[PDB]
Amino acid sequence: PIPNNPGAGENAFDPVFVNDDDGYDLDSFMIPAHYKKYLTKVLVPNGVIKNRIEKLAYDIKKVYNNEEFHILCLLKGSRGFFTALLKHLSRIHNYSAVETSKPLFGEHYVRVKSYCNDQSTGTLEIVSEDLSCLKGKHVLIVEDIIDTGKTLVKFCEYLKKFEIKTVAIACLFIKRTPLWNGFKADFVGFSIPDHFVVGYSLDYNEIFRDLDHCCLVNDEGKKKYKA
Amino acid sequence: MPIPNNPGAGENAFDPVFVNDDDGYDLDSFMIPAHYKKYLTKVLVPNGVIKNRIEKLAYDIKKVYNNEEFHILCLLKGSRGFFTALLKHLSRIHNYSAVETSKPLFGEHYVRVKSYCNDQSTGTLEIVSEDLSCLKGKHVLIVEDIIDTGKTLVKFCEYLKKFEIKTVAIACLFIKRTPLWNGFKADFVGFSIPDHFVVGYSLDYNEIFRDLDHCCLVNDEGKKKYKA
Amino acid sequence: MPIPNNPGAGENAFDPVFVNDDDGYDLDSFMIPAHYKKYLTKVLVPNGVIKNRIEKLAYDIKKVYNNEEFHILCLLKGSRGFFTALLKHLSRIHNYSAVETSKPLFGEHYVRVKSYCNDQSTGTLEIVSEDLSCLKGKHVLIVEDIIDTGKTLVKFCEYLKKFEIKTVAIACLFIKRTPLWNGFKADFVGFSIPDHFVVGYSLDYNEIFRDLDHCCLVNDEGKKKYKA
Amino acid sequence: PIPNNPGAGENAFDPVFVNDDDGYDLDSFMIPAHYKKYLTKVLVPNGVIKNRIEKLAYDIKKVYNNEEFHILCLLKGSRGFFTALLKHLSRIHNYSAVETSKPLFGEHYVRVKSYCNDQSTGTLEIVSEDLSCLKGKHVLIVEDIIDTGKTLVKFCEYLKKFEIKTVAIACLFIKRTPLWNGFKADFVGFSIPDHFVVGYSLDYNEIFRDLDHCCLVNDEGKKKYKA
Ligand SMILES: O=c1[nH]cnc2c(CN[C@H](CO)CCP(=O)(O)O)c[nH]c12
Ligand SMILES: O=c1[nH]cnc2c(CN[C@H](CO)CCP(=O)(O)O)c[nH]c12
Ligand SMILES: O=c1[nH]cnc2c(CN[C@H](CO)CCP(=O)(O)O)c[nH]c12
Ligand SMILES: O=c1[nH]cnc2c(CN[C@H](CO)CCP(=O)(O)O)c[nH]c12
Ligand SMILES: [Mg+2]
Ligand SMILES: [Mg+2]
Ligand SMILES: [Mg+2]
Ligand SMILES: [Mg+2]
């Protein structure tokens, strides 16, 4: 059953649970030398993220089977997630494809913006191609992280206007924060503790998007790169 | 060594890999999605060679920019794959040689640009509107998948200029030897390719084939099948 | 569809990718280790294309063996890279389509074999002795990096036969169009290449160049520099 | 300083510590469907292993700098480790190389065998090319795992005969078992709990070498594939 109750996560499998004290020393992995003073520890290594995304793609493929759906990348932060997910989905679909098979997905990009420093401004700006191209489509939203859940409640509310057939959510990280509004995704990678994470395309003020691993920015990093 | 700032002149550009008119590989030489075979004539550039060439391209870029902050601008949707592999190699190269005193090399931007229907330019370019004044006084590197007619870049560079950017240089994965070409050159260029419409590595025919790993030629049956 | 069992005849083998006499790329098209440039003339087959072709080769192998247990035999040292990429793609392909009732596809074996000094065969083959009776009554797939003179395989297949194996088939990454060739054919073959001594992708000149990612031609200066 | 006191690990950095209760559900990652009944959980995902090996290669490169050394792959189980380590070492060395630079390493293969089912037989068989080629060389031994430490004490004892200049050890896993003889490596990936692991080239009776992740074989798997 293709999901279609955004925020409920009706039949979602549990994420990898990342505990409050989980993670690794900066010296356990490769870290850009200059980034090292601004990071407290590695939370989730690049490699686990890729391994986990692979399974998500499989989970997704198993739900949609062969139904055409349309993947929306919520830019800029979900870019890493989205490229990884696409890679894996294509390989899984195309490895099992026969001569009579069909293409599986279309791809679309929406820039979504709300954060200043480490907090939501509680407002939301969006820029995309005209979303009327989604009318009557199965749509899969790909979001790097769910934090307050404001981005998605607000974004999914906007999507209701355009007569989309189904809306489902894939999320890489979900943060256990008391600021969360209850928005659950339908496919979820990791549940993480309440700290601001950078890397794997996630930023603090346009910095760290290039960091391979998901890490916790320390206070000095937050101060140095404050808006 | 200087940062390019003559968009379209490619003043000091290295030669791309030249792909001859007869170059290519049979579909059965490589992995090809089963349903796609009947719509392709051949593999023009394998995924792996594309990736190895993006790697060198990123090294060229780093040899020009050095440690100078620049802003990388992705022309969606077709440049995604190119842009992705480029970020990956640039970061590794920049971050491998980085020292504790170093700083990040680039910012990343996305503009969606559209002009094709089937295998031809409509001659009009749709630019999805975003305020680009964050780029005022910045070095910008445009990342484009392909130069064909050159219309996309001629028009987009006019647009960009109005934002009072410091410099504009162009990274292009493919450049097509078509008579339609208006003469727009890139400053870093992956391959020079024969005049055939290509799909794969994020390049589509009517939203189809983007997921195809290799750069291949769509055949006429596929062009008719997927006509808009 | 049947398991090959005529070592050297390549009875039903698919055609390899043909690399023409003039095929290749300039060293500056790809990443090349700085100290290696002066010893190479050109890139013959980029790393990425090698990898894409091993992928298809593994698919061919799986289309022949299906779910039948077989034993993969790595001819060290030069076949390591080839063997590695082959294991990777075979497992993914086998394990992606696997069901809960499935079983593993293959075992993996290693024999070290040696016969070259500089760029020529000594005409005598050193086989590092191991008891291979674990292979009695088994399908064995030999993985060899290159067929040149064909001496390695002719001799090694004689050796292997004494162990009373069920079948012997050959996977070869490269096969060289040299007049020295004794006619030994493989059953799965990656590329047919011109008659030049090649290095990279685990293939050496006197233990040098194995780490080089691309298959390139060593020049005469490098052959003289590293002469034994 | 190139290490040269095999078993002491004189100046070794601490490994990633993998706790007794650490790991992931089989359903968190891709697992060959048929292997799933024979595995209790994932211990260390493929991706963390690769990320960790990358840093080891860096650690190694930093010690040897530009001195020629010779890498010995202890077959069959250390194959995955060895190929990963080589990949990363070459890229790190060749990325920083200049025109006047030199090749960094030679490579050699030694088959070492001692286990039956999940235990050492307390004997050791070895097959390699003539190790006299190591005379006067810096040698780096690459071993997938240290368990009883019998393989390496015995192997390093054999190497003393051949006038090797230096012997250093790189190890991917070290198991916290009371059966351990005290042999420490000089470069170490992970400290792991006391269970028999499979995957990433590590087997139980030639099975599981192809499993991407490092996992704990369950009792049913041990029984099914008993010698
Ligand atoms: O821990 C973090 N790190 C980096 N970026 C973010 C963001 C910003 N980006 C998120 C959408 O891409 C906001 C999700 P919302 O509206 O539910 O808080 C939130 N949390 C973090
Ligand atoms: O051969 C092709 N294959 C697939 N897509 C395209 C496109 C569509 N996209 C190009 C910008 O990304 C148009 C470039 P222009 O304006 O210079 O002709 C052009 N040629 C090809
Ligand atoms: O062009 C080359 N480059 C590098 N190494 C080799 C070798 C060495 N190794 C080959 C077996 O792996 C010899 C194959 P044979 O006995 O059929 O000539 C042969 N040709 C080349
Ligand atoms: O947990 C495990 N899993 C798989 N294989 C092994 C082996 C077998 N292989 C090791 C050398 O490659 C033995 C190391 P030693 O002599 O110190 O016990 C030991 N432990 C394990
Ligand atoms: Mg952000
Ligand atoms: Mg297009
Ligand atoms: Mg050789
Ligand atoms: Mg074993």
XYZ file of N, CA and C in Angstrom, chain D residues 88-186:
297
model
N 42.875 2.818 -0.321
C 42.960 4.076 0.374
C 44.393 4.584 0.460
N 45.333 3.688 0.791
C 46.753 4.030 0.834
C 47.240 4.602 -0.502
N 46.908 3.931 -1.600
C 47.301 4.425 -2.912
C 46.744 5.825 -3.173
N 45.448 6.047 -2.918
C 44.845 7.353 -3.174
C 45.457 8.445 -2.309
N 45.653 8.157 -1.033
C 46.257 9.114 -0.156
C 47.697 9.432 -0.603
N 48.482 8.396 -0.895
C 49.857 8.595 -1.314
C 49.916 9.320 -2.662
N 49.095 8.881 -3.609
C 49.183 9.409 -4.969
C 48.570 10.790 -5.115
N 47.593 11.115 -4.263
C 47.039 12.472 -4.218
C 48.074 13.491 -3.739
N 48.932 13.084 -2.812
C 49.928 14.012 -2.257
C 51.284 13.899 -2.936
N 51.386 13.030 -3.935
C 52.646 12.775 -4.618
C 53.026 13.897 -5.587
N 54.328 14.131 -5.688
C 54.890 15.068 -6.638
C 55.708 14.278 -7.674
N 56.183 14.967 -8.709
C 56.889 14.355 -9.835
C 58.164 13.586 -9.418
N 58.761 14.018 -8.310
C 59.977 13.414 -7.778
C 59.674 12.324 -6.746
N 58.384 12.071 -6.499
C 57.945 11.043 -5.523
C 58.319 9.629 -5.963
N 58.128 8.657 -5.073
C 58.399 7.243 -5.397
C 57.162 6.353 -5.134
N 57.112 5.139 -5.734
C 56.043 4.206 -5.321
C 56.168 3.900 -3.833
N 55.059 3.615 -3.166
C 55.094 3.458 -1.705
C 55.276 2.013 -1.245
N 54.567 1.073 -1.869
C 54.563 -0.297 -1.365
C 54.645 -1.424 -2.409
N 55.141 -2.574 -1.951
C 54.986 -3.843 -2.651
C 53.949 -4.670 -1.907
N 53.445 -5.695 -2.579
C 52.345 -6.502 -2.056
C 52.636 -7.987 -2.195
N 52.276 -8.736 -1.160
C 52.580 -10.163 -1.095
C 51.437 -10.894 -0.425
N 51.308 -12.182 -0.738
C 50.208 -12.986 -0.228
C 50.668 -14.263 0.446
N 50.200 -14.438 1.685
C 50.449 -15.634 2.457
C 49.141 -16.248 2.960
N 48.842 -17.479 2.546
C 47.689 -18.168 3.115
C 48.018 -18.737 4.504
N 47.213 -18.365 5.486
C 47.413 -18.822 6.850
C 46.114 -19.509 7.243
N 46.199 -20.686 7.879
C 45.015 -21.499 8.200
C 45.139 -22.190 9.565
N 44.123 -22.077 10.411
C 44.153 -22.743 11.735
C 42.794 -23.087 12.327
N 41.726 -22.513 11.787
C 40.417 -22.676 12.414
C 39.580 -23.830 11.880
N 38.848 -24.453 12.804
C 37.834 -25.443 12.473
C 36.569 -25.053 13.186
N 35.493 -24.934 12.420
C 34.280 -24.298 12.902
C 34.606 -22.907 13.464
N 34.233 -22.655 14.727
C 34.501 -21.371 15.378
C 35.740 -21.340 16.297
N 36.603 -22.338 16.196
C 37.768 -22.413 17.081
C 39.080 -22.692 16.373
N 40.145 -22.163 16.966
C 41.495 -22.490 16.535
C 41.770 -23.948 16.812
N 42.405 -24.620 15.863
C 42.879 -25.970 16.118
C 44.188 -25.972 16.914
N 44.742 -24.789 17.188
C 45.997 -24.681 17.943
C 47.217 -25.135 17.155
N 46.994 -25.437 15.870
C 48.028 -25.729 14.879
C 47.981 -24.622 13.823
N 48.992 -24.540 12.966
C 49.013 -23.519 11.915
C 49.655 -24.036 10.626
N 48.938 -23.872 9.519
C 49.454 -24.193 8.188
C 49.629 -22.895 7.414
N 50.688 -22.827 6.606
C 51.009 -21.647 5.815
C 51.471 -22.023 4.407
N 51.047 -21.245 3.410
C 51.539 -21.378 2.031
C 51.805 -20.001 1.424
N 53.049 -19.717 1.053
C 53.314 -18.481 0.290
C 54.437 -18.584 -0.749
N 54.642 -17.503 -1.504
C 55.860 -17.374 -2.295
C 57.001 -17.295 -1.290
N 58.213 -17.601 -1.733
C 59.380 -17.659 -0.848
C 59.621 -16.309 -0.195
N 59.521 -16.313 1.129
C 59.563 -15.120 1.957
C 60.963 -14.534 2.114
N 61.940 -15.139 1.447
C 63.293 -14.594 1.432
C 63.294 -13.276 0.644
N 62.241 -13.038 -0.142
C 62.108 -11.764 -0.857
C 61.865 -10.594 0.094
N 61.650 -10.887 1.377
C 61.413 -9.870 2.388
C 62.683 -9.447 3.122
N 63.790 -10.152 2.888
C 65.081 -9.785 3.516
C 65.432 -8.299 3.357
N 65.637 -7.630 4.489
C 66.013 -6.213 4.488
C 64.875 -5.253 4.153
N 63.634 -5.757 4.131
C 62.457 -4.923 3.863
C 61.691 -4.494 5.125
N 61.051 -3.332 5.049
C 59.973 -3.006 5.967
C 58.752 -3.842 5.526
N 58.154 -4.533 6.491
C 57.028 -5.433 6.255
C 55.840 -5.035 7.131
N 54.672 -4.944 6.503
C 53.430 -4.652 7.200
C 52.537 -5.862 7.004
N 52.199 -6.526 8.100
C 51.305 -7.667 8.062
C 49.884 -7.147 8.176
N 49.019 -7.603 7.278
C 47.603 -7.255 7.305
C 46.763 -8.499 7.599
N 46.185 -8.478 8.794
C 45.389 -9.541 9.348
C 43.967 -9.019 9.615
N 42.979 -9.797 9.201
C 41.582 -9.436 9.414
C 41.259 -9.331 10.908
N 41.648 -10.347 11.669
C 41.283 -10.410 13.092
C 42.328 -11.066 13.991
N 42.448 -10.534 15.209
C 43.247 -11.140 16.242
C 42.304 -11.676 17.321
N 42.453 -12.957 17.620
C 41.520 -13.629 18.487
C 42.308 -14.248 19.651
N 42.816 -15.469 19.468
C 43.778 -16.090 20.392
C 45.171 -15.454 20.282
N 45.428 -14.748 19.188
C 46.791 -14.283 18.864
C 47.767 -15.389 18.481
N 47.279 -16.605 18.256
C 48.183 -17.710 17.945
C 48.753 -17.553 16.527
N 47.884 -17.229 15.573
C 48.328 -17.055 14.180
C 49.557 -16.153 14.087
N 49.488 -14.999 14.737
C 50.514 -13.983 14.606
C 51.762 -14.245 15.443
N 51.623 -14.685 16.698
C 52.831 -15.032 17.451
C 53.613 -16.060 16.640
N 52.906 -17.071 16.148
C 53.549 -18.164 15.439
C 54.093 -17.665 14.104
N 53.295 -16.884 13.395
C 53.772 -16.397 12.114
C 54.973 -15.451 12.251
N 54.938 -14.552 13.236
C 56.021 -13.564 13.419
C 57.299 -14.240 13.885
N 57.146 -15.373 14.554
C 58.272 -16.187 15.003
C 58.964 -16.765 13.776
N 58.180 -17.252 12.808
C 58.701 -17.794 11.532
C 59.457 -16.726 10.732
N 58.947 -15.494 10.759
C 59.539 -14.383 9.989
C 60.911 -13.930 10.470
N 61.216 -14.203 11.730
C 62.478 -13.797 12.343
C 63.671 -14.431 11.664
N 63.433 -15.535 10.965
C 64.496 -16.299 10.325
C 65.027 -15.600 9.080
N 64.252 -14.670 8.535
C 64.545 -14.177 7.183
C 65.130 -12.765 7.077
N 65.619 -12.258 8.211
C 66.390 -11.003 8.281
C 65.604 -9.846 7.676
N 64.344 -9.763 8.080
C 63.470 -8.698 7.655
C 63.878 -7.499 8.487
N 63.837 -6.309 7.899
C 64.325 -5.108 8.585
C 63.359 -4.701 9.692
N 62.076 -4.589 9.350
C 61.061 -4.284 10.345
C 59.762 -5.084 10.102
N 59.079 -5.446 11.193
C 57.759 -6.095 11.133
C 56.715 -5.303 11.908
N 55.696 -4.836 11.195
C 54.593 -4.146 11.831
C 53.284 -4.848 11.462
N 52.286 -4.683 12.326
C 51.009 -5.360 12.199
C 49.871 -4.350 12.061
N 49.009 -4.575 11.074
C 47.734 -3.880 10.960
C 46.666 -4.951 11.101
N 45.671 -4.656 11.919
C 44.619 -5.583 12.214
C 43.275 -4.848 12.112
N 42.283 -5.455 11.466
C 40.953 -4.821 11.354
C 40.148 -4.978 12.645
N 40.023 -6.210 13.135
C 39.311 -6.441 14.400
C 40.199 -7.082 15.447
N 40.009 -6.688 16.697
C 40.607 -7.416 17.800
C 39.501 -7.801 18.807
N 39.416 -9.089 19.117
C 38.318 -9.611 19.913
C 38.714 -9.658 21.385
N 37.847 -9.112 22.220
C 38.008 -9.160 23.660
C 37.560 -10.529 24.128
N 38.499 -11.470 24.107
C 38.260 -12.844 24.530
C 39.283 -13.214 25.599
N 38.875 -14.025 26.578
C 39.839 -14.463 27.587
C 40.897 -15.435 27.014
N 40.659 -15.960 25.813
C 41.624 -16.809 25.097
C 42.809 -16.040 24.474
N 42.832 -14.722 24.613
C 43.856 -13.903 23.946
C 45.207 -13.991 24.660
N 46.275 -14.163 23.876
C 47.626 -14.343 24.421
C 48.391 -13.050 24.668
N 47.792 -11.919 24.309
C 48.430 -10.637 24.564
C 49.040 -10.010 23.330
N 48.969 -10.702 22.201
C 49.495 -10.120 20.970
C 48.658 -8.895 20.542
N 49.282 -7.720 20.603
C 48.644 -6.481 20.131
C 49.214 -6.094 18.774
N 48.384 -5.484 17.929
C 48.828 -4.965 16.624
C 49.308 -3.522 16.728
N 49.840 -2.966 15.638
C 50.332 -1.596 15.681
C 49.341 -0.578 15.118
